[PDB]
Symmetry: C3
Amino acid sequence: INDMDYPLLGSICAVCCVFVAGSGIWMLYRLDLGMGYSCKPYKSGRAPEVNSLSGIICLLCGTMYAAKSFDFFDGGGTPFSLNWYWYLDYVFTAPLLILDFAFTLDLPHKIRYFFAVFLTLWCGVAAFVTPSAYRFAYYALGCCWFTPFALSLMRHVKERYLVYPPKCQRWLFWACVIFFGFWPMFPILFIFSWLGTGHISQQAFYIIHAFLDLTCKSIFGILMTVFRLELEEHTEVQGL
Amino acid sequence: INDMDYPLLGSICAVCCVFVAGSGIWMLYRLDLGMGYSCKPYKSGRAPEVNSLSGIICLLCGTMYAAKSFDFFDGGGTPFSLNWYWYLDYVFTAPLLILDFAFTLDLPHKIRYFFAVFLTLWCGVAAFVTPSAYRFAYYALGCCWFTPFALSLMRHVKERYLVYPPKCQRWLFWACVIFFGFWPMFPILFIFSWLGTGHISQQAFYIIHAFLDLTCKSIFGILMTVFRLELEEHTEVQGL
Amino acid sequence: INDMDYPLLGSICAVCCVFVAGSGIWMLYRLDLGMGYSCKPYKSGRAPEVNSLSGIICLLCGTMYAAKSFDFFDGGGTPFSLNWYWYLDYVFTAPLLILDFAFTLDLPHKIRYFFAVFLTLWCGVAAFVTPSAYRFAYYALGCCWFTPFALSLMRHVKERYLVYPPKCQRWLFWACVIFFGFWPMFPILFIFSWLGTGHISQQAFYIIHAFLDLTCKSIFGILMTVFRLELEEHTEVQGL
Ligand SMILES: CCCCCCCC/C=C/CCCCCCCC(=O)OC[C@H](COP(=O)(O)OCCN)OC(=O)CCCCCCC/C=C/CCCCCCCC
Ligand SMILES: CCCCCCCC/C=C/CCCCCCCC(=O)OC[C@H](COP(=O)(O)OCCN)OC(=O)CCCCCCC/C=C/CCCCCCCC
Ligand SMILES: CCCCCCCC/C=C/CCCCCCCC(=O)OC[C@H](COP(=O)(O)OCCN)OC(=O)CCCCCCC/C=C/CCCCCCCC
Ligand SMILES: CCCCCCCC/C=C\CCCCCCCC(=O)OC[C@H](COP(=O)(O)OCCN)OC(=O)CCCCCCC/C=C/CCCCCCCC
Ligand SMILES: CCCCCCCC/C=C\CCCCCCCC(=O)OC[C@H](COP(=O)(O)OCCN)OC(=O)CCCCCCC/C=C/CCCCCCCC
Ligand SMILES: CCCCCCCC/C=C\CCCCCCCC(=O)OC[C@H](COP(=O)(O)OCCN)OC(=O)CCCCCCC/C=C/CCCCCCCC
Ligand SMILES: CCCCCCCC/C=C\CCCCCCCC(=O)O[C@H](COC(=O)CCCCCCC/C=C/CCCCCCCC)COP(=O)(O)OCCN
Ligand SMILES: CCCCCCCC/C=C\CCCCCCCC(=O)O[C@H](COC(=O)CCCCCCC/C=C/CCCCCCCC)COP(=O)(O)OCCN
Ligand SMILES: CCCCCCCC/C=C\CCCCCCCC(=O)O[C@H](COC(=O)CCCCCCC/C=C/CCCCCCCC)COP(=O)(O)OCCN
Ligand SMILES: CC(C)CCC[C@@H](C)[C@H]1CC[C@H]2[C@@H]3CC=C4C[C@@H](O)CC[C@]4(C)[C@H]3CC[C@]12C
Ligand SMILES: CC(C)CCC[C@@H](C)[C@H]1CC[C@H]2[C@@H]3CC=C4C[C@@H](O)CC[C@]4(C)[C@H]3CC[C@]12C
Ligand SMILES: CC(C)CCC[C@@H](C)[C@H]1CC[C@H]2[C@@H]3CC=C4C[C@@H](O)CC[C@]4(C)[C@H]3CC[C@]12C
Ligand SMILES: CC(C)CCC[C@@H](C)[C@H]1CC[C@H]2[C@@H]3CC=C4C[C@@H](O)CC[C@]4(C)[C@H]3CC[C@]12C
Ligand SMILES: *C\C=C(C)/C=C/C=C(C)/C=C/C1=C(C)CCCC1(C)C
Ligand SMILES: *C\C=C(C)/C=C/C=C(C)/C=C/C1=C(C)CCCC1(C)C
Ligand SMILES: *C\C=C(C)/C=C/C=C(C)/C=C/C1=C(C)CCCC1(C)C
């Protein structure tokens, strides 16, 4: 229903777009500055390609949020909305997050996790354009794709967490809190939204998801950058 | 025309979705169990990333068929159909099949084959939403992309078939029968469907394509897994 | 407005489709013929995978232009148009061009350039389906993604241009003229088109963009092939 506070939504999207993009520019700037937590001009001179994935997602999320803000400023309903089809932008970003996490931790089965999230979001996308009882059918299919992905990622994370130093474990623990404390919240909001239970209104749904992207995209990326800085120095500069 | 036996279509799609997904879960389970046909815990401990492509496609095809079954149970015409736009799901799966086949056989020019199938399917997708004489124009363009792909894949397969042991050649021969015995059947069904000649009705078109996916996705994957098991043991455990 | 000379557009698209595809088939044929500018059957026998990206784009662009010609022959407005949504085909091709350029010159930060062009085009796609003042908002966002990509590519190109031999520098200089002489023309045409200033009519817009694809896709690819031939021989056969 076209009765929500659209200018508030645009302002919220504009504010987070600046925050996510600014964080992404920092980590990209920080990455090429030096390998270790202090500084290192690289042995070969150039940073690894996969290490920049965290920064690009924030800019990708920032660009996605910039388009969202333009949609809300125009009152919504624009031909290029990125808000009419929910989770559609997340299809481009969320699979890259776990891919970045896999590369950072060297977790095997990266391609399996990649398609797990990619198909998990796609089932979620199909689970609201269907105004029938099968809306939860796609929701169930997504959970069937996410639960064995939520699991088997806790295994590998838990197995490798005991190897890293406590200094590196610090951020890694916080990243896992971001990982396994806020990603499972996305299905819960879907149940309680107007699509399911109805506790969350449409206006609140955009706002809370706007707030549940700095932690998932920006702050999680920031932790990954710092954790990489601790990882890089400890492994290379500290030689451990 | 909305007069076909939709509940039959949903039941057929549901049955094959269970079969394709179950086969995919097996080969993923079988892969991490052990390298050789018997068992091997890997030298490095982790399976190669590209070896899991066969399993993911079946789950990808199973998830795609699960969405098809939901569409047919709801009587069709759902906003997220995956049946209104034919071959659209195949765009996500078919290029990965040859990519898996290329990696299994180490066939060069993988990227060329990948884009060959990717553009071949896309031309097929555009060749039914066009209710005019240009429907066959996109069909001709797809064949122009597929015939030099159907060829030059027979070359490389034939050249390498003489190298493998007869034990491995067994499955490889059967895979090539699946490869070069059923993929060329997709264009033929298009000609004889209501889009072209009209011999095949709309109801029969979904059913036969539902039956022509276990062989292409599941059974072909199963052969690839067993052929890999024979390849892996013969090369590593048997040292040949 | 449906008043432009559609058969002229189809003829122009058909002519360039033959030219782009024919050039792509040549460079693919030339690549496997031999490494050096003269001939070399490869040390391992097979060409590098990334070296074929230039040829595939031309065939990809040729196939895309073949679909454009079919759309214009049918009078336009076909369900599968590739002309109703501008720059949508460029999303599939343009990111691969810089990726090929990055691999040819071994320029680092390939993934950063890839997403830069990928998001630059996407902002352009959203910048005409929006019939409001926010059409230039997406345009500004695209320029914000392209200007730091147009820059930092001049740096790396300029830094490495002094290393190559003058024989190789010749084509590289011409490629950079194609690169940094015609890519910035795409935003300029958008400003002066009926979407912006209005100097360029709709009929002229397709024609000039049809002419501004041989240089970007075919001729640029041809230069890349010859530059690779000079690079390959000089580095391998000439041992320099
Ligand atoms: C900007 C950086 C982005 C980076 C990455 C982008 C990748 C993600 C791709 C996003 C796809 C966007 C699809 C959005 C479609 C929105 C449809 C929509 O809003 O419809 C509702 C709206 C009804 O609302 P009103 O008329 O206001 O009703 C109130 C009565 N006065 O309908 C319309 O406005 C009609 C829509 C016009 C056609 C839609 C065109 C969508 C743009 C196409 C480009 C995307 C390409 C997708 C590829 C496949 C080709 C379809
Ligand atoms: C689930 C796992 C999937 C994994 C991988 C997925 C990748 C493949 C992507 C699939 C894209 C799906 C597009 C399907 C569109 C279907 C359109 C359709 O059915 O229209 C017909 C139907 C007419 O039928 P009835 O009204 O019953 O007529 C009888 C009269 N009583 O029309 C409708 O229902 C209207 C359709 C509503 C809008 C369609 C929204 C499609 C969903 C968008 C999400 C997909 C994103 C695509 C990206 C580009 C953005 C467009
Ligand atoms: C061929 C090789 C291609 C290789 C790579 C391809 C990748 C790029 C994908 C291209 C997506 C194509 C989308 C084009 C949509 C065009 C819509 C259009 O033309 O609408 C205008 C036109 C109005 O014109 P007329 O009725 O003539 O008006 C005058 C009055 N007599 O409207 C129509 O014709 C209705 C359109 C029917 C539905 C459109 C179906 C588009 C085809 C879907 C396949 C693409 C899949 C996209 C994935 C997401 C799923 C949506
Ligand atoms: C037709 C219906 C739709 C078809 C598909 C529906 C869902 C498919 C089920 C899951 C598909 C694959 C999940 C992808 C992400 C998980 C990644 C993965 O499997 O990694 C492999 C990993 C094993 O790796 P190893 O090599 O032992 O690790 C040591 C490191 N060397 O697999 C596992 O951990 C086993 C699978 C997950 C374990 C969790 C156990 C409990 C799962 C809850 C069940 C939920 C319902 C799903 C039903 C089927 C589940 C198998
Ligand atoms: C504007 C119109 C649309 C534009 C494009 C239309 C179709 C384009 C034509 C084909 C494009 C490329 C096909 C992609 C899949 C084929 C892969 C490929 O070319 O592999 C290279 C491979 C050569 O590899 P070598 O290195 O010798 O192998 C030894 C291993 N070291 O190429 C070939 O085998 C030659 C091409 C295929 C051989 C088949 C011969 C007969 C083909 C039937 C012609 C059908 C019409 C198509 C017209 C143009 C065809 C060239
Ligand atoms: C919410 C709004 C939307 C969010 C995002 C909007 C645009 C984001 C800004 C740019 C994002 C990244 C651009 C991607 C392509 C550029 C590739 C890149 O950054 O390469 C790194 C490269 C540094 O590499 P080194 O390792 O030093 O090179 C030596 C080789 N070893 O970065 C740079 O060169 C610095 C950035 C570009 C330099 C150009 C300086 C002037 C730029 C004009 C500003 C235009 C406005 C954009 C605002 C923010 C720009 C930072
Ligand atoms: C519940 C409140 C939530 C508040 C929202 C969060 C606001 C952002 C602030 C940071 C959030 C995450 C930070 C994670 C922890 C890292 C901080 C830190 O201490 O990092 C250092 C160093 O690493 C860093 O520098 C990381 C911190 C830099 C973060 C910069 C903030 C994001 C950048 C955005 C700038 C542009 C934003 C535009 C303006 C916003 C307009 C709305 C690591 O070492 P220490 O443990 O201090 O040990 C000291 C000896 N080594
Ligand atoms: C014309 C009739 C078609 C029937 C449809 C096919 C039904 C599926 C049965 C298998 C089809 C393909 C099998 C390919 C041949 C492999 C069988 C085989 O023998 O494999 C072994 C070992 O490899 C295997 O174990 C592969 C076979 C396992 C296949 C399991 C079937 C698919 C899994 C689906 C389970 C879940 C399905 C859900 C229920 C369905 C509800 C509708 C290889 O060694 P042998 O030659 O026996 O040599 C012995 C000494 N080494
Ligand atoms: C302003 C006028 C623009 C005209 C449009 C362009 C027409 C195409 C002609 C070539 C354009 C770019 C060529 C770039 C320069 C390379 C030419 C060249 O000399 O290459 C050689 C060798 O490399 C080549 O062979 C590259 C040239 C081959 C290009 C073939 C033209 C494109 C192929 C299309 C064929 C099918 C087209 C279908 C018909 C069209 C119907 C409309 C490199 O060595 P040289 O400097 O001669 O030194 C000699 C000792 N080594
Ligand atoms: C309320 C929400 C946000 C947070 C609740 C999630 C908490 C309880 C979860 C998130 C991440 C999880 C941690 C992930 C990794 C490890 C490392 C392992 O070696 C011991 C368990 C431990 C330490 C987990 C304990 C539980 C944990 C801390
Ligand atoms: C009716 C349909 C399903 C099957 C017809 C396809 C048969 C005839 C095709 C499919 C795969 C083909 C095989 C593919 C590979 C080889 C290996 C080569 O060294 C000799 C030829 C040989 C053995 C081919 C013979 C023809 C073949 C068996
Ligand atoms: C109805 C149409 C579209 C397809 C149905 C035919 C499929 C399901 C059938 C036809 C002939 C069958 C093949 C016949 C014999 C064997 C030998 C066995 O050791 C492996 C499977 C394999 C290779 C079968 C796979 C399934 C198969 C290909
Ligand atoms: C009118 C349009 C088409 C062409 C104008 C663009 C010209 C002026 C641009 C395009 C490519 C550019 C070149 C790109 C690379 C180098 C190598 C460097 O070591 C010196 C500068 C030099 C030589 C640049 C000079 C300016 C240049 C030649
Ligand atoms: C914005 C970025 C992230 C990582 C978003 C992630 C979202 C989820 C993992 C959502 C999952 C869903 C599942 C499990 C099944 C039902 C539908 C959802 C889309 C909510
Ligand atoms: C489900 C998986 C597979 C591998 C499907 C493959 C389909 C084809 C190769 C279809 C090809 C077509 C071509 C050659 C040109 C006309 C249109 C078709 C889509 C039928
Ligand atoms: C056909 C191939 C190429 C490489 C096309 C490239 C097009 C551009 C770089 C277009 C860029 C745009 C930007 C900078 C922002 C506004 C919108 C444009 C799409 C014109």
